[PDB]
Design a binder for these strands. Structure first.
Ligand SMILES: Nc1nc2c(ncn2[C@@H]2O[C@H](COP(=O)(O)OP(=O)(O)OP(=O)(O)O)[C@@H](O)[C@H]2O)c(=O)[nH]1
Ligand SMILES: [Mg+2]
Ligand SMILES: [Zn+2]
Lengths: 90, 29, 49, 378, 172, 48, 82, 101
RNA sequence: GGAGGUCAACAUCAAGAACUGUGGGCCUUUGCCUAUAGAACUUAUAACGAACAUGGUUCUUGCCUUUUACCAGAACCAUCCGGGUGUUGUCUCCAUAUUUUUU
């Protein structure tokens, strides 16, 4: 975000570090469809914006968590089939 | 609601009682 | 803070109190914290006056 | 679509592109006539990794890339209304849509036999009549099965001797290949059109090769041309109480229905199968992960090879294109065609010029004039 | 986000402030258009305020403020933010009309002629069929009064249909 | 079920134990399968 | 979100740089050619059916039988055209 | 900048099973078997390969104290700046080693 | 001998993914290849410190009467509060069988 000069909606705002600012991206020839809002330019930073200088590549994902907590009444055991879980039919 | 207080207002991190194993306010002038 | 590390110097490193200790002029004791604070206030007033 | 920022650094780009065409085997890189290099990858992460390696490892220059778009194709509808001889020697050809069952069988390269087809024509001729229900004549006579669509000879015997036909068969089949490789609307490949040619030394072959392509362009543009878009399929994994959020998001994609919904046993998960168009999918993977706070994950894949009609009308002068807002769903098919013709330098040199792909470029002044007099083909 | 009951009061303050300057300005037209294209409630507030401005508040305004109301409501009717059928309330008889009403109608039709151009205006006034404007039922003195009013504005070309009907009902 | 959880939680718990055992290890009818799975899928919400 | 809009920074601008959406901005012979080709094609489909039925279960006999079928069906279509 | 890779030949990992006896078993064609480890995203195939790598070598030089203790997985065959930062195998990699049933 | 120290000294801590020693051969010591022994601490969403300050010079800006004092981005460099591990010393408290194996 600092390198690209964008602002993700709840974080900090810096200076550009490249403050000096053809008919390739003209209006007639580009198909306007699904706007390229700033989260996409942060997430995939070599695809959505030209000239990424000083940009590093940010850890695609972690799989999906399904940790189940047990905080109610304590008298439930450690191993217990939670009401969140789907059944395993036959 | 909160696990140890038993009141419905707040969250488990916000309960002012001590965590267990198992009110007048200044009017805004 | 995370963008610019300032990377400490791991050689010679003269520390202050470890070299102020080797003199005969400093001595050592244990006192209460509030007494040490009051003594520092008396000393730091006396120096600047 | 990619173009280097400083043109004097174009060789250092071009060399490096060849490196990528070795190391990434899924890419398709081609250089258009307008100099702009277009590259084709499996998906959004794949293009990100490509442009990292192109920007930091190999070329070490700076390049202006376009925004994401897709590769269209094109096909036809009901039937061609009339065979039109084309002369520049007079080759005529008519067009028809293929069977809906035959396209999904040629997509996986099987009949019923395998590629390469038609080395044994009796074995092929049994299959079409046994399964697909053709006549005996066309099942006897198929000259080619090129990659998406079939060229059959119908014929007229007593109109031309078949030794004159088979003296020139390689040249007219090369003309069919050369016409399927780039099509009439926006030089996009033609996908799923049963051609039949109804009526037609080395100099004659070099006259035949560019004339069969023009004939096929007339034959396709008579037969109600439509535009086809490719559709990703989407494999979603969300927690179960976050199921409606996913459904809400699909309504913002225009063309993204949800087919199947499977409850993963013993886990608090729920696995959702449903399609999305690929031109709608430039930020699907970000929006799903943000709007479900990380309790969802999608994977967008294209290995069934399904292609759907782009909604609208291609030959429609009247539909408006709102210039930095997305198009209505009836103007959308025209919008894609016109923007692709302006990327590929086809129409010309003008702010919002309307050189629609009409049929009059190929045929005649007067014959198109009578087609307008009947009001058939605007 | 003013509540639904006070939207008519907001529209009233906007019109009363628009009257106070020495001339009409497109500020008070643009803000009214961006109100009407936001929600149905603002459009029903303006469709109420046009009737409340014609039936009640006509009698109090001087001609300097009635000229501004003419250009304002004509400029809203001209760009179809208000329907033409909202013009059905005004009547043009000798008993129903008043002087402060007829000056307002003159300035509204002046604005509609300037913007639409006497041929699109003919098309709209034919398609909307206003009985107060064009009485083709009979009543020779009323249709005479309407013809005389539209010739005294300077319209003329609207009046050919009503003049033909008045001649054919004088000849019988 | 939310009322039974509100007062007698151990009897409710053993009810779900037996019902889950009936669903997930039994030769059982298909309409009863879709009804019991509807019970579980709304037990996710427990009577909105 | 900085979606293409807004200042680059509020440093030299003498403002706060607080940006907000605007609620006011939501807003024939050729037909006879194909029919002739359809009729001649149906006639040729008949003799290709004859070739399929003959050769399915005598090259010259099948070729002459197909030629005689084309002759008979061509004369029959010359009679059925008038 | 690009890979993490062992350029000094003397710093090779020291192969418990005597690689010359591994190369000698390549003469019999039925002794060699080629297996590819495929599967879905983030399922464990690189760490599965990394178990076999750890048990086949004596001293891996890139093994830190944390990947010994078991906090962070050694992703030995990920090997690239892409696959370390993105956390995601993007290119196929392999290892040829001998194993006993 | 054993445990411990808000005790000291001296080495060492950011690099072809990267360490040292030894034997043999080649070049003429350095270096290359080959066989061997050991490697504590730190490090891969990269670093001693799940913590985080200030100073110098040169660019680019911001407040604009000038210099300190400043606004906040970049590059190159330093100072400071701290940390690990190893060797030695010192100090304190205690201790002196019925088919392939064999019937
Ligand atoms: N919770 C849990 N995580 C595991 C387990 N095994 C592997 N993982 C995690 O799964 C993640 C994926 O591991 P990898 O093997 O590197 O991923 P992959 O299988 O190669 O899939 P790719 O993205 O194609 O490499 C890692 O972050 C591991 O921490 C496991 O048994 N339990
Ligand atoms: Mg992997
Ligand atoms: Zn509480």
């Amino acid at each position: 975000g600092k390198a690209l000069n964008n602002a993700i909606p709840g974080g900090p705002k810096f200076e550009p570090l490249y403050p000096r600012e053809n008919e390739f991206n003209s209006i007639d020839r580009v198909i306007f469809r699904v706007p390229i809002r700033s989260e996409y330019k942060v997430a995939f930073p070599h695809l959505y914006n030209s000239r990424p200088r000083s940009v590093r590549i940010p850890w695609y994902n972690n799989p999906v968590s399904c940790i189940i907590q047990n905080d109610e009444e304590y008298d439930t055991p450690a191993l217990f089939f939670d009401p969140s879980l789907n059944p395993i039919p036959h | 609601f909160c696990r140890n207080c038993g009141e419905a207002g707040h969250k488990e991190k916000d309960c002012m009682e001590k965590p267990r194993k198992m009110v007048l306010v200044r009017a805004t002038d | 803070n995370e963008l610019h590390p300032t990377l400490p110097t791991n050689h010679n490193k003269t520390k202050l109190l470890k070299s102020l200790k080797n003199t005969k002029y400093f001595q050592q004791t244990t006192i209460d914290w509030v007494e040490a604070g009051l003594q520092l206030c008396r000393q730091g007033h006396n120096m600047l006056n | 679509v990619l173009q280097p920022l400083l043109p004097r650094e174009l060789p250092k780009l071009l060399d490096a592109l060849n490196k990528i065409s070795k190391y990434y085997p899924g890419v398709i890189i081609k250089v258009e006539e307008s100099g702009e290099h277009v590259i084709l990858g499996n998906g959004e992460l794949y293009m990100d990794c490509l442009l990292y390696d192109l920007r930091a490892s190999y070329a070490k220059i700076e390049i202006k890339i376009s925004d994401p778009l897709t590769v269209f194709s094109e096909s036809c509808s009901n039937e061609s209304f009339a065979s039109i001889p084309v002369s520049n020697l007079s080759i005529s050809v008519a067009a028809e849509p293929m069977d809906s069952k035959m396209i999904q069988d040629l997509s996986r390269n099987t009949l019923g036999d395998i590629d390469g087809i038609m080395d044994n024509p009796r074995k092929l001729s049994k299959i079409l009549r046994t399964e697909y229900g053709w006549d005996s004549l066309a099942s006897r006579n198929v000259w080619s099965f090129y990659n998406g669509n079939v060229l059959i000879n119908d014929t007229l015997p007593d109109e031309i001797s078949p030794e004159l036909l088979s003296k020139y068969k390689e040249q007219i089949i090369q003309g069919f290949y050369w016409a399927v490789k780039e099509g009439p609307l926006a030089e996009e490949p033609i996908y799923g059109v049963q051609y039949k040619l109804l009526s037609i030394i080395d100099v004659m072959k070099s006259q035949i090769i560019p004339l069969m392509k023009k004939a096929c362009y007339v034959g396709l543009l008579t037969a109600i041309p439509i535009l086809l878009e490719p559709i990703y399929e989407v494999d979603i994994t969300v927690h179960a109480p976050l199921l409606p959020i996913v459904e809400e998001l699909m309504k913002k994609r225009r063309g993204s229905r949800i087919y199947k919904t499977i409850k993963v046993a013993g886990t608090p998960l729920l696995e959702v199968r449903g399609q999305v168009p690929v031109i709608e999918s430039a930020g699907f993977e970000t929006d799903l992960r943000l709007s479900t706070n990380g309790l969802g994950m999608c994977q967008l894949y294209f290995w069934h090879k399904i292609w759907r009609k782009v909604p609208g009308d291609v030959l429609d002068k009247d539909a408006f294109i709102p210039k930095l807002k997305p198009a209505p769903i009836n103007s959308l098919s025209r919008d894609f065609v016109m923007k692709t013709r302006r990327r590929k330098g086809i129409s010309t040199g003008g702010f919002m010029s309307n050189d629609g792909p009409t049929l009059e470029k190929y045929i005649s002044a007067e014959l198109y004039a009578q087609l307008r007099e009947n009001g058939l083909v605007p | 986000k003013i509540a639904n009951n006070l939207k008519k009061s907001v529209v009233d303050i906007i019109i009363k402030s628009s009257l106070q300057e020495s001339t009409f300005s497109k500020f008070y037209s643009i803000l009214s258009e961006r109100m009407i294209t936001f929600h149905r409630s603002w459009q029903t507030a303006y469709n109420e305020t046009f009737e409340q401005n014609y039936t009640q508040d006509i009698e109090d305004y001087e001609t300097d403020q009635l000229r501004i109301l003419g250009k304002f409501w004509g400029h809203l009717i001209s760009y179809e933010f208000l329907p033409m059928d909202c013009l059905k309330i005004i009547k043009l008889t000798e008993e129903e009309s008043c002087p402060q009403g007829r000056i307002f109608i003159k300035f509204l039709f002046q604005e509609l002629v300037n913007e639409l151009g006497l041929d699109e205006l003919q098309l709209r006034l034919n398609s909307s069929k206003l009985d107060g404007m064009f009485p083709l039922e009979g009543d020779a003195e009323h249709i005479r009064y309407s013809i005389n009013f539209f010739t005294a504005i300077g319209l003329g070309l609207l009046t050919e249909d009503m003049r033909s009907r008045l001649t054919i009902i004088q000849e019988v | 079920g939310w009322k039974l959880a509100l007062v007698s939680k151990k009897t409710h718990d053993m009810i779900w134990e037996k019902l889950r055992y009936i669903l997930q290890t039994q030769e059982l009818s298909s309409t009863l399968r879709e009804s019991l799975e509807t019970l579980f899928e709304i037990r996710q919400k427990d009577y909105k | 979100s900085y979606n293409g809009i807004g200042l680059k920074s509020a440093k030299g601008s003498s403002t706060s740089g607080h940006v907000q959406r605007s609620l006011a901005s939501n807003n024939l012979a050729v037909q006879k050619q194909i029919e002739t080709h359809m009729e001649k094609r149906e006639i040729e489909v008949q003799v290709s059916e004859l070739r399929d039925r003959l050769e399915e279960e005598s090259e010259e006999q099948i070729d002459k039988k197909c030629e005689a079928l084309r002759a008979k069906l061509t004369n029959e279509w010359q009679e059925q055209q008038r | 900048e690009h890979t993490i890779f062992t350029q000094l030949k003397k710093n090779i990992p020291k192969t418990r099973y005597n690689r010359d006896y591994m190369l000698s078993m390549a003469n019999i064609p039925e002794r060699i078997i080629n297996v590819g480890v495929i599967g879905p995203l983030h399922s464990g195939k690189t760490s599965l390969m990394d178990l076999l790598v750890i048990d086949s070598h004596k001293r891996i030089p890139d093994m830190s104290k944390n990947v010994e203790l078991g906090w962070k997985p050694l992703r030995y065959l990920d090997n690239l700046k892409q696959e370390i930062d993105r956390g995601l195998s993007i290119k196929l990699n392999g290892s040829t080693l001998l194993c006993t049933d």
